[PDB]
Amino acid sequence: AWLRVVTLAVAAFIFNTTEFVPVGLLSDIAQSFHMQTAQVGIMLTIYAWVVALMSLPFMLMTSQVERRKLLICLFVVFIASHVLSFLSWSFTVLVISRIGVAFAHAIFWSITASLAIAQALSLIATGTALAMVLGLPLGRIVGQYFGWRMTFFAIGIGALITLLCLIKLLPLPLLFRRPALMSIYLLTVVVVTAHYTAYSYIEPFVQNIAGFSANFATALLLLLGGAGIIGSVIFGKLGNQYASALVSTAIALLLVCLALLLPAANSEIHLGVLSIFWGIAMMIIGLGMQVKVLALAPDATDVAMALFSGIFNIGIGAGALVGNQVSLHWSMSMIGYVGAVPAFAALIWSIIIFRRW
Ligand SMILES: CCCCCCCCCO[C@@H]1O[C@H](CO)[C@@H](O)[C@H](O)[C@H]1O
Ligand SMILES: CCCCCCCCCO[C@@H]1O[C@H](CO)[C@@H](O)[C@H](O)[C@H]1O
């Protein structure tokens, strides 16, 4: 009935939760491995960049496989990797485990984007919604109380319990040429990097760079959650029209918040509002892209979305890596400004292609 989709929604919740979660566990993991909080962002780069390389191949090579059998194996790789993430003894192994999840993710996102056949985005994006506001926060909380490995194991078990309802299912190019969208692919990579230079380390920035608490951090990851929620629902209303404007402004705003990271770093209420805008910004620039890809590739959407998935993660890992370099070579404070550079260019490029198309 509904329940064959509802279970899938929870699956949507849980796979995003693990993706986000290590953004507010970097310090718990740092303590454990004896490496600076910035040094562990490789595990974000590797995750994304591995899910970048394989995203097309994997969903492609598995196109033959019936959906129930598919999701099963998929979820087995996930659950096992998490056990290994919990067991992990070297940061090498931790990242080996992350790669294990990467593969699971790679496959997954395109299967459900196919299995999504605004009644799918409704039940799925509620999963992804809840994956932000509960997932990462509680994820952060459990890491504080029970240690990160335990957090990972938790997910691991969660994936198992969701699976037995998934075991109650029945058995089931020219795009490069098209330069309307390859433009949109470009804007995506550029803009994402902007966000993920700063955001990826919003914890070590909050604690180490700014006068603030570990609980203030955990407060902020919630605040970017709801801002994400607000953002999503702002995009709900005026989404079919003005969307080009709404992305361009959202990038504009994103420019703003990045540049104003240290101007806000001393006001704990400023971060509070920075995050409310920042969060709304991203969600718009996120949802403006998806929507504009679906538009610019009705033919072979899965492939469009599969490709789109991969380039976003390129941008994540790139973001994460520059964020790592700034902190490791220069200083973690300036990730704000360094972020705002791609943010500007994207805001330029956005308006260029939007006013072009
Ligand atoms: C793994 C995901 C696939 C990447 C496609 C991203 C779209 C951006 C355009 O790609 C172009 O392709 C050239 C090939 O040589 C590169 O020189 C150059 O960087 C780039 O302008
Ligand atoms: C200048 C007018 C035309 C704008 C065209 C889009 C601008 C793209 C900027 O390039 C980016 O520069 C970063 C430098 O660190 C790289 O990390 C990143 O991967 C790369 O893609």
325/25 Cα distance (integer angstroms): 19
Does ligand 2 come within 6 angstroms of the Cβ of 318?
A: yes
Question: What would you report as the CA-atom Rg of the chain, rounded to the nearest whole angstrom?
Answer: 19
Quick check: helix, strand or coil at residue 168? coil
- In the structure encoding, which two tokens stand for residue 212, read together? 């603030």
352/26 Cα distance (integer angstroms): 38
26/218 Cα distance (integer angstroms): 13
Ligand number, closest to the Cα atom of 317: 2
238/319 Cα distance (integer angstroms): 29
Nearest to 99 by CA among 155, 37, 51: 51
* Total Cβ atoms within 10 A of residue 339: 27
**Residue to mutate (ligand 2; options 190, 322, 347; most atoms within 8 A of CB):** 190
DSSP category for residue 135: I
CB 264 within 8 A of CB 271: yes
CB 21 within 8 A of CB 136: yes
CB 27 within 8 A of CB 203: yes
CA of 347 to the centre of ligand 2 (A): 12
Measured by CA distance, the residue closest to atom 3 of ligand 1 is 311
CB 75 within 8 A of CB 159: yes
| Number of the ligand 1 atom closest to the C-alpha atom of 52 | 1
Q: Which residues have C-beta atoms less than 6 Å from ligand 1?
A: 52, 182, 185-186, 310-311
- In the structure encoding, which two tokens stand for residue 205, read together? 């920035």
Ligand number, closest to the Cα atom of 347: 2
DSSP category for residue 238: S
* Total Cβ atoms within 10 A of residue 329: 8
204/184 Cα distance (integer angstroms): 32
Resolution in A: 3.4
- In the structure encoding, which two tokens stand for residue 5, read together? 């989709």
Where do the structural domains in the chain lie, given as residue ranges? 1-356
CA of 311 to the centre of ligand 1 (A): 10
Does ligand 2 come within 6 angstroms of the Cβ of 326?
A: no
